[PDB]
Structure formats: C-alpha cells, structure tokens
Design a protein around this ligand. Sequence first.
Ligand SMILES: N[C@@H](CCC(=O)O)C(=O)O
Lengths: 132, 193, 150, 419, 49
Amino acid sequence: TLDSFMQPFQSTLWLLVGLSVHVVAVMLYLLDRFSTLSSAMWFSWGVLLNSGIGEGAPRSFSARILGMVWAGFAMIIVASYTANLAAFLVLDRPEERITGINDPRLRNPSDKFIYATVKQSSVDIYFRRQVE
Amino acid sequence: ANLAAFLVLDRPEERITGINDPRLRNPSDKFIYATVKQSSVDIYFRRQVELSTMYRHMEKHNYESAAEAIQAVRDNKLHAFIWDSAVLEFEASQKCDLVTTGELFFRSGFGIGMRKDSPWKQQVSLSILKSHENGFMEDLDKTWVRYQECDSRSNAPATLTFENMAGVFMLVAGGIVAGIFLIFIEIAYKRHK
Amino acid sequence: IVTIHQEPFVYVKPTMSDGTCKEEFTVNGDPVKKVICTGPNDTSPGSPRHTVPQCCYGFCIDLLIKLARTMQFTYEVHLVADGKFGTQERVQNSNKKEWNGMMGELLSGQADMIVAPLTINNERAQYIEFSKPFKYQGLTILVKKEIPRS
Amino acid sequence: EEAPFVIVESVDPLSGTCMRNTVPCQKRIISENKTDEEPGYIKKCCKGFCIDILKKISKSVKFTYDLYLVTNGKHGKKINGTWNGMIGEVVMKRAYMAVGSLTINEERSEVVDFSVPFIETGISVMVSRSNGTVSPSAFLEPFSADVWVMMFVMLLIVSAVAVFVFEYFSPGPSFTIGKAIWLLWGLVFNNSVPVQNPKGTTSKIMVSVWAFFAVIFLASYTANLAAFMIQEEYVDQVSGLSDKKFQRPNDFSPPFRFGTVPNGSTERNIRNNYAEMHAYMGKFNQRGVDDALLSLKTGKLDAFIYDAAVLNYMAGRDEGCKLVTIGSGKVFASTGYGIAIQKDSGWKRQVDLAILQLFGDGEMEELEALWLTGICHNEKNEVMSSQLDIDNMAGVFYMLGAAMALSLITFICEHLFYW
Amino acid sequence: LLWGLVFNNSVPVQNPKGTTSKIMVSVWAFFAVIFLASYTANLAAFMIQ
Ligand SMILES: N[C@@H](CCC(=O)O)C(=O)O
C-alpha cells in the first residue's frame, strides 16, 4: 500500500482527463454562444469535482446533450477511480509463510536464505541425526 | 457496502483434491463413496494398510457395472465415484452436470493382452510403437475423444442477468398507480377545500 | 477376441431388422466402420440365457480393424458372459484359485486377444504379457456441480 | 548428465568421499593428452530420482551394479550404421543395463529391449508468455444491452407520462418534457447536473421513488467493475506444429525463428514426417539446452521443441513465472522412458515386476512430489496492483468523440433547418 | 456548506461567490470524495467480524 492518492491513475491519464475538461467547456461555451463562458466552465468543473457550484444550464439542445454526456463521463470516471482505489486498499497479503520443517526451502539451502542456531547444544545434535 | 459484498465473492466450491484427506480416512454415514467391484481400482485400494476402514466402507456396497454407477451418481444418489481419468473426462464432456475434481494417482496405461508366448505379441508391440508416432492415435483421439460441447469457466467474474430489473420495474409500476391514487385523493380533498 | 463394455471406448447398439446395423455418417464426413458382436443378453445372462447378435464400433474396434489390416489376419469379436474385468479368486473354501471374467475366459483357451481398456499391474501381468500402452490416464473423483445458487 | 533425474556431484573438499544416500560414480575422460595413455582416472558422486529408482530396483531384485559414464555420444543416433553413445556401449557388449532419461522409439526398441515405461514423455513447444493489451468496451461488461435498452425506454416513458399527467392534473415557466427527462437524467448519474425542481406532493413522491431506483442502480452497477477492468484475455501464438506457420514459412510473415537441437529422437521424428520443417530448422540449430533457453529469453527465437517433461520442469522451477508451455499440458507423440536391457535377457521380467510393484506401492507419487515440484508449476496468483493506463479505459473516449460529432451534426442540421 | 460537502451531499445550502471561494470549494470537494473512496473500502467486512 503506497502512501499517495494518485496511484490508481497514471500521470498520462491524469493529464488527459485534465485537458479534456477544458476543451469540453470551451466547446460548450462556443456552442452556447454561436447557437456564459465562465458559467459553463464552472458548470463543467462542478459536474466533474461533484461540488455544489454551478449557476445554470445551457439552453441549446446539442449543448444539453453534450453536457449530459460529459456528466455521465465524469460519473464513470469517478466510479472507476473509487473502484481502483478500493481494489488495492484491502485484501493484499501473501498466501502463506513457512509452517513445516520438511519444506523444500530447508531441504535445499540456498545463499539467500540464511538460518542457523547456537553451537554446542542439543538442537544441533538433533539436527545432525537426520540422515535426510 | 452490504449489497456489493453479497453479490460478489462467488468463489469455486474447492472440493476434495487429494486422496489422503481426513474425510476419506474416516468414512462416515453422510459421505458415501464406492466403485465397481471386480476391478483393478479395488485391488489398488485394498493394498493400502492405512486405509483399511476406507476399503471396508467401499466394499460394504459395490455397484455391478460402470453404467449403473454413473446412473446412480447422476440422480442425486451417490456422493463420490472413483474411476479412470479418461472415462470420467468423457462423461463430464458429454454430460455437463458433473465435474471431475481431484488429483491423478496410480497412473497406469492401457495395454493389449495376450498369452505367455506368441510372436503376435511381439509384433503388436512394434506395430503400436510405429503407429503411435505417426498421428494415427492422435487423429483417433481428436475424432472420438474430442467434442467440447459444453462451455468453460475460464473467467470467474460473470455478468448480471434479468433478475432485479424485473423487480425494480414492477416497483416503479406499483409506484405509478400509487401516485395516481394519491393525486386522485389530493384532487378530491382540494374539491372540498 | 473378447471386448468389454465401456462408455467412450466400445459402443453396443442393436442391429436392424434386416440383419445388419444402421449405417450412419459422422460429422467429419467419413463412413463409420462398424462390426457385429455376439455378446450376451441386455439385462443379464442368468435368467434369459440366450445370446443375440449386436453391433460393435468405437476406439477399440477401430484399433482392431487397423491391426487386422496391418497384419492381415482374421478375428471373431464377442463380449464376455461375466460382464466384468476379473479379479483373483483365491477363496480357500474350494481349495482352488483361478481368474474369472474376461481374464478367466482368456486363460481357459476360449480367446486369443483382448482389445479393451485393460490396465497394467503386477497381479495381472504376472500371468500374461502386455504390449506397449496406446493411451495414458489416471484416477480421479467425479462429483456434481452442487448448483451454486447463493 | 542431464536434468535432475540423475546428477553428478563433485568430490568432497576434505572428506574425499560421497555424502549419505549416494553411490560412487566413475567418469572416463579422454580429452587430455593421449601421448602415453589417460583412462580417465576420475571418480565422482551420483544421485537423483533415477538413482533412487535404481536403488529401489536393486533392493528388490538383490543385484549389484557399477556406474560408468559414456564419453562417446549423448543418447545415440544412427551415424553411418554404427551407434555411438549409450546405445552403442550397450550393443557393443560393454554394458548390460542402461538407466536414465532414454527415450523409447521404434528403432531403439527394435535393436534394444526396453522395460515398461515409468514416466510420461512427449513433444511440446515452449514459447514466451504473450500478454494481451486490453478488452474493449469494458465499461458495459456488468450489464446486458437489452437491460440498457429496457432501462432507457422505462426512463423515457416514466418521465414523459408521469411528469406530463401529474403536472396537468395537480395545480417559473411550465414544466416541459425536456426538463422532465433532464431531472431523471441528473438523478440517475450520481448527481450534480443543476436541474429545475418540481411542485406537487405526488410529483415529489415520484421523484423520491425514482431516486431510490437510481440509488439501487448505482449500487448494482459498481459491483464488479474493477474485476472486469483487469482481464487481459491472453491468446496463444500458435496452436501447434500443424498450421502453415511451421509447415510453409516461405510465403508468410517475416521469418519466424524456431528450431531444436540435433542428434535426438525428436530430430529423427521430425525428419521422417516434416522434411521442409526440418530443412528450415537446420539453420537455427541450437548448441545446448541452457544456451537455447537463454536465446529464447533474449529474443533471438520464439519456439523451442524438446521433451515435454524437462521443459515443464524448467518452466515450473524457474525464477518466478517467465515462460509457459503452449496448450497447458499438450504432448505430441506420447512416449515414455525406461531401462535399456541387453537383447535376449532374463532380468527384463524382474525389472518389469519391480516397476509394477513400485507403481502399486505408491512410492512413485511420493518421489515425483519430492523431485518434480516447481515454483510456477501451480496456478497463477491473483492479479493486483493495476495501473489503468490510457489503453486500459480509453473505451469511453470513443463514446465522448461520437457524442461530440453527434452534437456537431445536430447543430449543423438545426442551423440548416432554421433558414 | 463544508459539512454538507463531506457528508456526500444534499443537505441544501447557498453557493458562495468569488473565484477563490470556488477554488476552495473544489479542493474541499476533492478531499471529500477522497474521504468517501477511502472510507467505504472494507466497512462491510469490518462490521461483521
Ligand atoms: N536426445 C534424446 C531426446 C532428448 C532427451 O532425452 O534429452 C533421444 O534421442 O532419446
């Protein structure tokens, strides 16, 4: 579990979703003007950050359709983000550790796994009595 | 959170895999398992001195043939049946109501029988060794032992069906007539006020 | 040659009224080659002790036809009256020990070859020879789907 | 000296002997100066699964055996009619039995008697794990298209009929159908699209019912979205040695690199059946198993043909999970190993009975679980720590672009119809 | 306003005025959505044990 909040999405995806909102707001403002701008920008930002800002909605039919599609897109973005964030926030652990002495890890001692005991003791005598 | 947790986590049954499990070591009256009498599997099962109770529980009731055994285990009667891997695999491929669960043990091929001394016995071995690496046995296996009629379970997460959609649609339909009745009551009350 | 009944290996279908089997093509497009058996009755040979002609085809029959075409010999396939593989009958009540079933019929001199899914082990191969296996398999457990409807 | 069925152990640094459960091994080396003589005065230690099988056979038949390594050939191939190697050493009266990883084929069985097989072997191609990029339309996975159409038509009918009737019956401009459907649209997509709230107790009750329906629909929708946005749908490169990719690689894609090592049973099996394939692989012949594995890992080739058992063992007992065999357990020309015995012998029946007794005793499964378990031999672990890059969830940008184009064409149509 | 914002929503409030106020509201809404995405991770499993 990394100590951050931008982990579920990559930097490229963050940059793309940050650039998309600006061009969507610009297109909405242009369609509302040639068929106001700051209000549309704040609306596009509030339908993305889920805040309570936003004065009014545009009146053009195509503008209304585009705004509804952008709102549905922001909803899907938020849902995917929270799903990804909950995905690796719980149930993240290895299967099992060493439990027995007859495991193949101890049968083939490698250089990475180092294990020993105290010399001149009964544990060493018991360990040297196993012919296998 | 509760609605998400209970429509999820549909994990596989994870039934018995090995033969040395404590379930088969201590055969109870609830779990009934047997095989076909007068066969090599019974001889292999009676050779394990550590499974004398299991062999006794198995031999307490044995079927007459494999057909009767599969017909019994199919109609919710027998709990477990042990046989060859190929026969059970073909049965699971043909009938998709049964799934083979377990690990392979006592691997032994199928060989043609003969007398104690005959040149035909020496010729059949060479014929099989020559015809087994020329795609003939592979072709016969792909023709007779390769159907793949049923589906697969490669993906555990499955999509949703039309289960709760009908429920919420009936709920909306009832709410419609409820609102109609409420509007009628409102009009009747406003007519007197 | 004595064959045993097996679901995926040896099929046993009744013949037509004429005297032969209903010739039916496969899905690949080749005519299925089938032979006629003379096995026991359907239920058991005990009460209705009478043999009726039947049809025989499958993996074992195909391998038998291949071997017959390769070595150019003749055969007479017929099922076993016991209907079982066989076991070691060493009961001391009769003071005698002998094999029964298909192996018992083979050792009695009635048959010469066995084309059937017969496994390989010490007890059976101690008295008869086994050639190289043509198919490998193992043992497993078959259970129901249990119908997960949580 | 091969895969850990029978392995050679070096001499002890100070003890000068072999450890427990080990037999004295002899190796004759003739690569030194042959001025006077050099009969390979070198003694080593040998052990493994094959040594365990040999000890189990010797403890049941009660015989004594010596160990002698061959320095002529690997396994033995027909070169000008004179067998050189272990087969040649057995046929030249220099030995009686031959144990190890020898393959049983037609020629060797015709010239040398073999015992019953004790392990399954076959031909299987080993290729690198090909990974998928992304499955498109992943955001519509936890639902059916019919369900979407039903939800849409229900939304439309409910909005129109309910709002119109309840506004006309029950007593700011009028509440048109546009705002009527806009209210329900804002209500099911989580919220915030600023919307024009209605008047009337029954209208508010219907809005509350629709809000309950919407809050049920979102809980039902993100049940398993993350689980569906991770699947890659891995696809195998080739099905086997039967398509045109290996039969005729002449008029096809850029030359696919594939081959095997010479002087083996699989080489002869391919030469007898596939002449053109063998002629093509002759230029891509390897010079060892480890060298071929390193070449496959680097990228100089993408297919290796060898025995199924050793390839599966190397794929399992490897660093993590690097390569996997195609088909997940496929074997071509299924054969088995054995013990080569001299022609017209009597110990063949005893060896067969001992092998059958060992199979019936259950020790073979224990020896296999002790000497054939691998790291990646088990199933793949759960896929966690995802990134969800542009290609992972870019499937909604296509919808966004299509909606932008639809808005543009509708604006153009409205401007054209206005005149 | 801020309390309604971290709650999830709908407690009804008057929207402020000013660009800096709107920026602060957006930052608080991002903090609020982060808090719910990090609060309902394993609540179901934790309320049963
Ligand atoms: N070269 C061997 C096959 C490969 C192997 O066993 O490593 C043979 O011809 O039998």
